[PDB]
A paper describes a structure:
Actin is the constituent protein of microfilaments with essential roles in central processes in the cell, including transport, cell division, and motility. Outliers of this functional consensus are actins of the phylum Apicomplexa, including Plasmodium spp. and Toxoplasma gondii—both notorious human pathogens. With less than 80% sequence identity to their canonical counterparts, actins of these parasites are among the most evolutionarily diverged eukaryotic actins while still retaining most of the core features. Here, we analyze phosphate release rates and high-resolution structures of wild-type and mutant Plasmodium actins in different nucleotide states, bridging the gap between structure and function in understanding the polymerization mechanism and the instability of the parasite microfilaments.
Contrary to PfActI, Mg-PbActII crystals contained only ADP just 2 weeks after crystallization, despite showing a slightly lower Pi release rate in solution than PfActI. According to PCA, Mg-ADP PbActII is less open and more twisted than the Ca-ATP form, situating toward the twinfilin–C complex and the cofilin-decorated filament structure. Measurements of θ, d2–4, and b2 support these findings. However, in the presence of Mg2+, the His161 side chain adopts a different conformation in PbActII than that seen in any of the structures of PfActI and most other gelsolin-bound structures in the PDB. The new conformation of His161 in PbActII changes the water network by occupying the space of one of the waters coordinating the active site K+ in PfActI. Curiously, recombinant PbActII expressed and purified similarly is methylated at this position. There is no evidence of conformations 1a or 2a in the PbActII Mg-ADP structure. This can be rationalized as follows: (i) methylation of His73 ensures that it is mostly protonated and therefore repels Arg177, interacting with Asp179; (ii) Gly115 of PfActI is threonine in PbActII, and the G115A mutant also lacks conformation 2a (see below); and (iii) Ala272 of PfActI is cysteine in PbActII, which may sterically block the backbone position of conformation 2a. PbActII, which has an ordered C terminus in both Ca and Mg states, has a threonine in the corresponding position 114.
Numbering used by the authors:
A (entry chain G): -1 to 125
B (entry chain A): 6 to 38, 52 to 376
């Protein structure tokens, strides 16, 4: 319930305007390499933080968790939990969004320089 | 490796974090000659069977500690001093009971660390959601729990004692209307099995009742009793769980499942109700009846405003969704320092459970 303190990716989250993307990997939140931004494994689940810095120093946060059609239950469950934990860490100020493969919001799609792309496979289940 | 224990009003679901299902599932009952769990129902020389968590709230802490002893030492066969323990609690669990749970874990079992999670939250996580309304129908209690962005909305939560135990009793009564007398503890367990195996929800009750009278063969199924004799089970198959939607059938004044879901949604901010309607999540054994999702979809659509999008999610393993959510939660890298340690409890007192577990 309280905010996460030490996890290195939470320390990185929401510090400045930008787009931060993590993948659930065996019960952990692992950063997605920059060159893979926007290419989602349909076997996996992901967490996305969009930070918008209004020109008055204030930060606006949108948290999106994306569920691939073949992701395992540990992965989708962890994506939701991590989303709440990141919101907690940002003092409850993030707006959360559930994003399912092929049913994503136009806001979520709009983040990506040339839209969402999908590929088969992913990391194995933690179960 | 963490232990996950879901303290059910009727069934303890326990096992190891990181497993995809609970390995030890047994009744949350005490038999006074103490016997715990399955042994308590198999002994003839029993004064009384006691439910220490009868309607999801612990009432006898000494009996609850006996159930936990049996869980750790007879079922899981682990040393509690070597494992963090995730325990579940009902929504709206009284503060003094959360404190007593913590005290017993640290002072009676010497666990190194523990945590307490709300059952409905865990089920929502197991479905891959942070927002929705969980309808958790168990053995001695049904909870209706709206949740937004990871937190229950306490002013909108409903609890009723009506659940699976009442439906077992109703099935017993319906059979009595035919001259069968299932009365003994063993006979009651047979009726529970008939209920689980053969019942189903009628999408059109009036038409299913007409079929059972005029075309009985299309409703009727035989059930094999432990001695091999067969009994015919007809309209009971759908009349029994119909009580969940129309509780006057069992003499109760509480509303049906759908009405209570609707009233809970109506206690929430109008601007999240659309999300709740599209994220109705069923959990617990008494939501396992065939066709219940479609029936609830139809009822909720008829109650909701024009063009409201309704979705009922009925996950196939939902008898264990609470436990599975806990197994996921307690496996996460970020959960490693969310446990209450023994040393924090000694430092801050039992009050720590309110500041670390919510
Ligand atoms: N397949 C089923 N169909 C109908 N009822 C079921 C089924 N399986 C289990 N139940 C009932 O669900 C109840 C147990 O559910 P559970 O969610 O474990 O309750 P609790 O958490 O309150 O102990 C029992 O009344 C049991 O008879
Ligand atoms: Ca995967
Ligand atoms: Ca928020
Ligand atoms: Mg339960």
């Amino acid at each position: 319930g309280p905010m996460v303190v030490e996890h290195p990716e939470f320390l990185k989250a929401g510090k400045e305007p930008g787009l931060q993307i993590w993948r659930v990997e065996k019960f952990d939140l692992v950063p997605v390499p920059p060159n893979l931004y926007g290419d989602f494994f349909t076997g996996d689940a992901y967490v996305i933080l969009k930070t918008v810095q209004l020109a008055n120093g204030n930060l606006q946060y949108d948290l999106h968790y994306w569920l691939g059609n073949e992701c395992s239950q540990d992965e989708s469950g962890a994506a939701a939990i991590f989303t709440v934990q990141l919101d907690d860490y940002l003092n409850g100020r993030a707006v959360q969004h559930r994003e399912v493969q092929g049913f994503e919001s136009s806001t979520f799609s709009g983040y990506f320089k040339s839209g969402l792309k999908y590929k088969k496979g992913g990391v194995a289940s933690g179960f | 490796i963490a232990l996950v224990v879901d303290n059910g009003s009727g069934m303890v679901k326990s096992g190891l974090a990181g497993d995809d299902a609970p390995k030890c599932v047994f009744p949350s009952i005490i038999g006074i000659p103490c016997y715990v769990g399955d042994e308590a129902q198999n002994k003839r020389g029993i004064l009384t069977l006691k439910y220490p968590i009868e309607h999801g709230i612990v009432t006898n802490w000494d009996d609850m500690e006996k159930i936990w002893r049996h869980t750790f030492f007879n079922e899981l066969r682990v040393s509690p001093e070597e494992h963090p323990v995730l325990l579940t609690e009902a929504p709206l669990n009284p503060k003094t009971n959360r404190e007593k749970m913590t005290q017993i874990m640290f002072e009676s079992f010497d666990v190194p660390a523990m945590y307490v999670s709300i059952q409905a939250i865990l089920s929502l996580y197991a479905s891959g959601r942070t927002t929705g309304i969980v309808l958790d129908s168990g053995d001695g209690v049904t909870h209706t729990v709206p949740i937004y962005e990871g937190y229950v909305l306490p002013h909108a939560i409903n609890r009723t004692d009506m659940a699976g135990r009442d439906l077992t009793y109703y099935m017993m009564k319906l059979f009595t209307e035919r001259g069968y007398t299932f009365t003994t503890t063993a006979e009651r367990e047979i009726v529970r099995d008939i209920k689980e195996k053969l019942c189903y929800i009628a999408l059109d009750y009036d038409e299913e009742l007409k079929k059972s009278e005029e075309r009985t063969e299309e409703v009727e199924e035989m059930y094999e009793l432990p001695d091999g004799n067969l009994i015919t089970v007809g309209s009971e198959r759908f009349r029994c769980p119909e009580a969940l939607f129309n509780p006057s059938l069992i003499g109760r004044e509480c509303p049906g499942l759908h009405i209570t879901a609707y009233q809970s949604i109506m206690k929430c901010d109008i601007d999240i109700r659309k999300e709740l309607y599209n994220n109705i999540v069923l959990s617990g054994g008494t939501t396992m009846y065939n066709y219940i999702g479609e029936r609830l979809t139809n009822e909720m659509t008829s109650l909701a405003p024009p063009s409201m999008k309704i979705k009922v999610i009925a996950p196939p393993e939902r008898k264990y969704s609470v436990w599975i959510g806990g197994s996921i939660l307690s496996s996460l890298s970020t959960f490693q320092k969310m446990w209450i340690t023994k040393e924090e409890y000694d430092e801050s007192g039992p009050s720590i459970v309110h500041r670390k577990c919510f």
